Design a protein around this ligand. Structure first.
Ligand code: RAP
Length: 107
């Protein structure tokens, strides 16, 4: 599943609600591998709708349990990421992914 290790605490009370749009900054990295993406490196926050299955389960489940302003390291096992299939040319099969995520705003 997804494990959370807080980097910076949030307000501890404002969590993503159904339908809301999460505004996040993230950096993705293969466990014991290379970084493959960074919204911070291109200075451009990433947005996605909660509960609309727009992003892998682990990323959404991680964000869903974070409060406004919180930043955390998410460790996602393959079953809540890209599984046995992986992501063509970027994420190999059975890859555990590490995501440094910061919940910047809720829209
Ligand atoms: C160049 O950058 C890519 C993102 C890259 C691709 C490669 C991966 C390593 C990665 O580097 O992101 C990455 O770090 C990553 O794994 N991410 C992105 C951050 C959130 C977590 C994860 C993810 O779920 O990606 C996503 C993963 C790859 C695919 C999804 C996984 C969950 C599953 O339920 C979905 O349906 C099967 C598909 C990519 C996204 O976050 C983008 C935003 C979303 C989608 C494509 C789908 O939700 C789609 O559904 C039709 C939509 O509703 C969108 C809005 C429609 C419009 C036209 C498409 C825009 C495409 C934008 C693509 C972007 C910015």
């Amino acid at each position: 599943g997804v494990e959370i290790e807080t980097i910076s605490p949030g307000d501890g009370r404002t969590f993503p609600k159904k339908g809301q749009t999460c505004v996040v900054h993230y950096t993705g990295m293969l466990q014991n591998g290379k970084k493959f993406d960074s919204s911070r490196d291109r200075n451009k926050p990433f947005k996605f709708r909660i509960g609309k299955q727009e992003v892998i389960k682990g990323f959404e489940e991680g964000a869903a349990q974070m409060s406004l302003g919180q930043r955390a390291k998410l460790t996602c096992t393959p079953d809540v990421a890209y599984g046995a299939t992986g992501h063509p040319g970027v994420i190999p099969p059975n890859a555990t992914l590490i995501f440094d995520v910061e919940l910047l705003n809720l829209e």
